[PDB]
Amino acid sequence: EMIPTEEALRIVFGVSKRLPPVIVSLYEALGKVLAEDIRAPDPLPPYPASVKDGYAVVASDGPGEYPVITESRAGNDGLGVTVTPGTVAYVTTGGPIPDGADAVVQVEDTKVIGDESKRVKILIQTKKGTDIRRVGCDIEKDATVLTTGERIGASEIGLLATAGVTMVKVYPMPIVAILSTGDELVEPTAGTLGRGQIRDSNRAMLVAAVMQQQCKVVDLGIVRDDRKELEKVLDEAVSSGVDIILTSGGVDMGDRSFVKPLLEEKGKVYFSKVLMKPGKPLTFAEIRAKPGKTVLAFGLPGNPVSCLVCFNIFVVPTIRQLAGWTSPHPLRVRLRLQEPIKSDPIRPEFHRAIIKWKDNDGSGTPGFVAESTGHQMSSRLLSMRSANALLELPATGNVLSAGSSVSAIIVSDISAFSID
Amino acid sequence: EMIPTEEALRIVFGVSKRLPPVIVSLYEALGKVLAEDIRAPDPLPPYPASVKDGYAVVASDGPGEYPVITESRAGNDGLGVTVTPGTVAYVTTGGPIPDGADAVVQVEDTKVIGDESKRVKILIQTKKGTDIRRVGCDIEKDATVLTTGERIGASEIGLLATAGVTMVKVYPMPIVAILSTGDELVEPTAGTLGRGQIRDSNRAMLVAAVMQQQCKVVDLGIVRDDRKELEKVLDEAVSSGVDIILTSGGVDMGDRSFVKPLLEEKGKVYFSKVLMKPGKPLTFAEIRAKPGKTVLAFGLPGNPVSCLVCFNIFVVPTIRQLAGWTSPHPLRVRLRLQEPIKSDPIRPEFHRAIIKWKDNDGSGTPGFVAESTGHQMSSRLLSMRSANALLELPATGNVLSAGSSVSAIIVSDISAFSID
Ligand SMILES: [Mg+2]
Ligand SMILES: [Mg+2]
């Protein structure tokens, strides 16, 4: 009954489809994947431009004293002026090279002479083309500067701005609906708890996890253990326009667990048991919204750790696939254990760790190392605290010694890792 | 005159100060650093809770047929009912254990008997405490679940919700003002460019870079090469409440470069020349806003590459330090070059690369590898395209062969790295 994680992931990958592209403004494009190629409408620079503050010269003149016939910093400066042999022009970095000049001698290789007509001493012999950016040096006209499937970061925004593109065709992020289930739950605003009550922590945790993925959230609240109630919430969520529904709890054993029977009634359940610790009751379904698009549903396990681990392993790549990422899979690295860890005898375990890069990983060479977050019980959300990786432990039941190597899934921005 | 990058960074670190903490809502706390410890007001679970769907029993009774005297799923279910020797109670996962029961036998190790009073056959001999979470098992009452200086991610939001904390004391992000300088610039909305004009790309690039750091941006636009004009913009920016001002251009040589003289007049310039390629004219200053707080100013170089490299190396750790990060420094790793690279003979170079983790880094062991983004000229923003690292090349002027190892600064979320 329990399918391997690799199979469950292949099923999710084959079912999930990229969202239709949209047109957004320049700053709305940040973080999104391009759905069109971007072409430069003009060259960069669009005019021969100086690399230095100095003088535009005729290289063959060589060292000597010359009159300064114009000054060129921007725009129309020096328009219609020709730098002929025996003359020079002052230029600032980025200034347009006047017609006739063929090199720039930086100001450090010159000296101003006299005082009232402007004259300069060129102190070196330069070569044609020195310290000039030719037209199209950096970007040629009609070059493809960005391509469909490329994710937009800060330099890509810079390239869009360079090319004068301020309305961009991209793949959008999915809209995600989230609900919690359970008669024992109370809102996280609750003070004193009554007997048999706990605060709903999964919903806020998932809202935050989805916010970190840059998706709009639809918070559907706490749903009680009543089939008709959950049916109504799920039906309205499916017809609301969301792309993904996340539930937690009420998906495994127990006589008031209605998520799985409702997903089986409303859509197609691809799996409901995965060979993994934590996360074995994870349920994945596809529901058709009536005209009419597809909605993906993840029936996440109720235990807090299980809920977040399943989100990290299955929901994150699904969000990325819907958002057009060509490489949605998580970064996996190899690392060395800083302490001994016992694997499970039946299920491959995703053991929470805090990893860091060290100059010596224990073997004399630089590498990542990992520390366990401690007890791994699925009810213990403190085992996720500060965890930036999931160690992929095989189902051997053996104690993996300190210094041994394992594969690890990196789950939090690797560029925000705390240094050793 | 050119100070080493390590010295420039130490100066910035010593001058930069953590911002005063504020109180925010639960979801506004995501991404922020805690400025208080968080204590659990009650235990998790706050009642003895079942780990399984099954029956709460007296362990010493052993296998046998017993009447089901109550059912417990949440809240007050089973309140006042005592499970005595010779009786059992049905329980769902998370349900409160009735008084008198001391173990749970999961439903798979039982069978329902008869049909009309409820009776069950317990098929195993269990042990006291099996499949029960004692009060405080996961979190003890008054335990510190989160500490001052801890960054809040999704699991931390979950822990805040668990503890009923929905108003959180955190360090805020800095507010950042951004402007571009130059008579040659036009807005990125411009179509056909006139002679000697280019689109302003640095400002949008920096707005995006600051957005990626989760800071509010104040966009001050294009400023022309006029001392009084820039003075007015800088003066108003300083008194606006921002914490950081970023300029680009007009900071090195040239007779219409007013950023450096204005920073020297209005505040204290700590350095204006750094021994690095690109980025050597980087200028750093502290300005006092009149009552009255300190404002940090970075006079970034005008060349697009230089502008973003300096942002990545100097501004990012400054943002993080202001936002209370205890480890603001960028992740540095060791990696192997996939192609030969020529270092500079005078300045240590921050060479743009696209890095990835490989199962074989070329030496037979897993590791990061790097490819150059190509020509590294500072006017060529295409050299930043897709770059996720800066290779730290020493100032040797030698060709570093393919297969050699270098240090690299990771500049983009390592958990969003495209896999090999
Ligand atoms: Mg439940
Ligand atoms: Mg300028």
PDB file of N, CA, C and O and ligand atoms in Angstrom, chain A residues 73 92-94, chain B residues 181-185 225 248-251 256-257 302, ligand 2:
ATOM      1  N   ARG A  73      29.871  64.587 -22.129  1.00  0.00           N
ATOM      2  CA  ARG A  73      29.413  63.833 -20.967  1.00  0.00           C
ATOM      3  C   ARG A  73      28.125  63.070 -21.196  1.00  0.00           C
ATOM      4  O   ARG A  73      27.935  61.995 -20.633  1.00  0.00           O
ATOM      5  N   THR A  92      33.755  62.191 -20.107  1.00  0.00           N
ATOM      6  CA  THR A  92      33.521  61.554 -18.813  1.00  0.00           C
ATOM      7  C   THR A  92      33.101  60.123 -19.093  1.00  0.00           C
ATOM      8  O   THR A  92      32.679  59.809 -20.215  1.00  0.00           O
ATOM      9  N   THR A  93      33.166  59.248 -18.075  1.00  0.00           N
ATOM     10  CA  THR A  93      32.805  57.851 -18.269  1.00  0.00           C
ATOM     11  C   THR A  93      31.347  57.775 -18.694  1.00  0.00           C
ATOM     12  O   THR A  93      30.494  58.345 -18.021  1.00  0.00           O
ATOM     13  N   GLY A  94      31.082  57.054 -19.782  1.00  0.00           N
ATOM     14  CA  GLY A  94      29.760  56.934 -20.353  1.00  0.00           C
ATOM     15  C   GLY A  94      29.439  58.029 -21.358  1.00  0.00           C
ATOM     16  O   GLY A  94      28.395  57.959 -22.006  1.00  0.00           O
TER      17      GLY A  94
ATOM     18  N   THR B 181      21.953  58.457 -10.779  1.00  0.00           N
ATOM     19  CA  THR B 181      22.499  59.743 -11.203  1.00  0.00           C
ATOM     20  C   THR B 181      22.943  59.693 -12.653  1.00  0.00           C
ATOM     21  O   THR B 181      23.460  58.674 -13.123  1.00  0.00           O
ATOM     22  N   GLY B 182      22.771  60.809 -13.351  1.00  0.00           N
ATOM     23  CA  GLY B 182      23.358  60.956 -14.674  1.00  0.00           C
ATOM     24  C   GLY B 182      22.529  61.709 -15.683  1.00  0.00           C
ATOM     25  O   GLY B 182      21.361  61.404 -15.886  1.00  0.00           O
ATOM     26  N   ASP B 183      23.174  62.637 -16.391  1.00  0.00           N
ATOM     27  CA  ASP B 183      22.521  63.375 -17.450  1.00  0.00           C
ATOM     28  C   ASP B 183      22.194  62.512 -18.667  1.00  0.00           C
ATOM     29  O   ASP B 183      21.366  62.913 -19.474  1.00  0.00           O
ATOM     30  N   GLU B 184      22.880  61.366 -18.830  1.00  0.00           N
ATOM     31  CA  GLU B 184      22.659  60.478 -19.966  1.00  0.00           C
ATOM     32  C   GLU B 184      21.478  59.526 -19.763  1.00  0.00           C
ATOM     33  O   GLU B 184      21.114  58.822 -20.692  1.00  0.00           O
ATOM     34  N   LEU B 185      20.936  59.443 -18.546  1.00  0.00           N
ATOM     35  CA  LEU B 185      19.893  58.473 -18.283  1.00  0.00           C
ATOM     36  C   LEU B 185      18.532  58.918 -18.740  1.00  0.00           C
ATOM     37  O   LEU B 185      18.168  60.075 -18.582  1.00  0.00           O
ATOM     38  N   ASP B 225      23.159  65.597 -13.077  1.00  0.00           N
ATOM     39  CA  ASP B 225      24.515  65.931 -12.617  1.00  0.00           C
ATOM     40  C   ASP B 225      24.635  67.405 -12.275  1.00  0.00           C
ATOM     41  O   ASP B 225      25.284  68.206 -12.983  1.00  0.00           O
ATOM     42  N   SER B 248      23.780  55.376  -7.240  1.00  0.00           N
ATOM     43  CA  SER B 248      24.762  54.787  -8.132  1.00  0.00           C
ATOM     44  C   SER B 248      25.251  55.858  -9.062  1.00  0.00           C
ATOM     45  O   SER B 248      24.510  56.792  -9.388  1.00  0.00           O
ATOM     46  N   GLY B 249      26.488  55.728  -9.484  1.00  0.00           N
ATOM     47  CA  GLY B 249      27.138  56.687 -10.362  1.00  0.00           C
ATOM     48  C   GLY B 249      27.584  57.956  -9.656  1.00  0.00           C
ATOM     49  O   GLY B 249      27.312  58.158  -8.471  1.00  0.00           O
ATOM     50  N   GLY B 250      28.310  58.787 -10.385  1.00  0.00           N
ATOM     51  CA  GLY B 250      28.723  60.098  -9.907  1.00  0.00           C
ATOM     52  C   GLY B 250      29.540  60.086  -8.651  1.00  0.00           C
ATOM     53  O   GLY B 250      29.493  61.052  -7.890  1.00  0.00           O
ATOM     54  N   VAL B 251      30.306  59.022  -8.427  1.00  0.00           N
ATOM     55  CA  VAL B 251      31.058  58.840  -7.180  1.00  0.00           C
ATOM     56  C   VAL B 251      32.578  58.728  -7.391  1.00  0.00           C
ATOM     57  O   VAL B 251      33.317  58.794  -6.403  1.00  0.00           O
ATOM     58  N   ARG B 256      31.531  66.217 -13.036  1.00  0.00           N
ATOM     59  CA  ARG B 256      30.130  66.392 -12.665  1.00  0.00           C
ATOM     60  C   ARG B 256      29.686  65.198 -11.824  1.00  0.00           C
ATOM     61  O   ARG B 256      28.559  64.731 -11.948  1.00  0.00           O
ATOM     62  N   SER B 257      30.577  64.719 -10.948  1.00  0.00           N
ATOM     63  CA  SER B 257      30.360  63.578 -10.045  1.00  0.00           C
ATOM     64  C   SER B 257      30.289  64.137  -8.639  1.00  0.00           C
ATOM     65  O   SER B 257      31.323  64.410  -8.027  1.00  0.00           O
ATOM     66  N   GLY B 302      28.759  53.378 -10.771  1.00  0.00           N
ATOM     67  CA  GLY B 302      27.765  53.481 -11.833  1.00  0.00           C
ATOM     68  C   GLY B 302      27.685  52.291 -12.767  1.00  0.00           C
ATOM     69  O   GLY B 302      26.611  52.006 -13.316  1.00  0.00           O
TER      70      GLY B 302
HETATM   71 MG    MG C   2      27.465  59.557 -14.333  1.00  0.00          MG
END
